[PDB]
């Protein structure tokens, strides 16, 4: 009978960097997904394998709400079957994804004159992430045959890059807050 704590996710003051994406497990509660879809405060609300309207009539064992910040031109990568810096090295959705991807412009909260250096992404990785894999490692990347031993230099690079969000950037370089709802024993979360 309790409402699902969606407000803690969508209205959080701080969001995580994509490399260190947050996951909120939703359990034992009731959820109005049409209320979310009816806010219309979203530039992206794409549902895969389900209908936003029919979500209010379904039940699931576990709902996950993943949350992070990326740039506008990278929102397209938050979808099944996609490739790119985010999908390959930061946040990967499965090809059979059953859930919803919601995004909104956050230039008013996440950008700063002089640059916000708090939001980062992984630029350097040897291999692709598996679906729902989180890599928070900060080890020096070896681009050559010589081991780096924690020392930056030729062929030895820090793996993370700041987005440096500035308000004067175009929409593609501007910050976007993203919430991925994943719908998965007994059901615990249901709609009305």
């Amino acid at each position, epitope marked *: 009978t309790n409402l699902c704590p969606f407000g803690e996710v969508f209205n959080a003051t701080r969001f995580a960097s994509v490399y260190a994406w947050n996951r909120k497990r939703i359990s034992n509660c009731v959820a109005d997904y049409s209320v979310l879809y009816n806010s219309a405060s979203f530039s992206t609300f794409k549902c895969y394998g389900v209908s936003p309207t029919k979500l209010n009539d379904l039940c699931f064992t576990n709902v996950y709400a993943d949350s992070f910040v990326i740039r506008g*031109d990278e929102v397209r990568q938050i979808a099944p079957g996609q*490739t*790119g*810096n985010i999908a*390959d*090295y930061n946040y990967k959705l499965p090809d059979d994804f059953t859930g919803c991807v919601i995004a909104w412009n956050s230039n008013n909260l996440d950008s700063k004159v002089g640059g916000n250096y708090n939001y980062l992404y992984r*630029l*350097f*990785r*040897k*291999s*692709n992430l598996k679906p729902f894999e989180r890599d928070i490692s900060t080890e020096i990347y*070896q*681009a*050559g*045959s010589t081991p780096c031993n924690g020392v930056k230099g*030729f*062929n030895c*690079y820090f793996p993370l*890059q*700041s*987005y*440096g969000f500035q308000p*004067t*950037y*175009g929409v*593609g*370089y501007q910050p976007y807050r993203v919430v991925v709802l994943s719908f998965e024993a007994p059901a615990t979360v249901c709609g009305p």
Partner: antibody
Amino acid sequence: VQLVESGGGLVQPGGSLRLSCAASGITVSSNYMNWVRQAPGKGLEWVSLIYSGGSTYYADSVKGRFTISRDNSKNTLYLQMNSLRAEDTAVYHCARDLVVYGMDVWGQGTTVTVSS
Amino acid sequence: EIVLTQSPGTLSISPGERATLSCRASQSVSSSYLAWYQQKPGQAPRLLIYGASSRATGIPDRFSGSGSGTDFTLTISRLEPEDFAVYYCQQYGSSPTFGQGTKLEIKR
């Protein structure tokens, strides 16, 4: 540290050609790697890119015709070029891309001529 | 997609003077992905500047870069004869794009 391109030559329109780039001092499979070409008397044109993790991307002018790949045990990058056209005539360079640090390592290039 | 327009197409100067080469992006973009290359006649391109303002390894002090948003600048502070060449700016959005090149020629 060097990249050495091989395989350039004369090909008929509609033909195919595989370019190779043998690296030393970087590991191809650990890097963003590009092919960049330069038609005679023209400017630089990015052609194709491969990520360390295998994702590939192509310029619209060569999409569906060119395939970038690599052989880790030979530390070598390839460009397979099919359905070649006269406008593909150029010097083809391989380059290692550091994205935020630029393309720091460039090969001297290999010349491709497409003509009837 | 980002389109880079360099200006002027040809710059005509004398040894010892200061050169100012411009690169205009069609949208406001991040400076961390802006690079400049030199191509001397017959040779491959050579990285001069990365991240808009950082000099690459072994590049002489007279080369410097600056700018932000849509307007980026390469400045060569005291031209030497070997500096007369073609210069390309480059941006990395989701893949590399190049400007069309500025020729630096000797004035007479």
